[PDB]
Design a protein around this ligand. Structure first.
Ligand code: CL
Length: 60
């Protein structure tokens, strides 16, 4: 469980558990699979869903 920040914007694929986001959006990473899929909470929108880890950076 950690925070990550979007380094790019993203528009979700319709009728999926993906969420949209903007560059700079902060997320709580609840869980992550080996293939890069994360279940997160977007802290700006309070939406939960799927994101790919290559669109985010570790928060230090
Ligand atoms: Cl949708």
């Amino acid at each position: 469980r950690r925070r990550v920040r979007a380094i790019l914007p993203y528009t979700k694929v319709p009728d999926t558990d993906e969420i949209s986001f903007l560059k700079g959006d902060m997320f709580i990473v609840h869980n992550e699979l080996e293939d890069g899929w994360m279940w997160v909470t977007n802290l700006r929108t309070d939406e939960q869903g799927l994101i790919v880890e290559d669109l985010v950076e570790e928060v230090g």
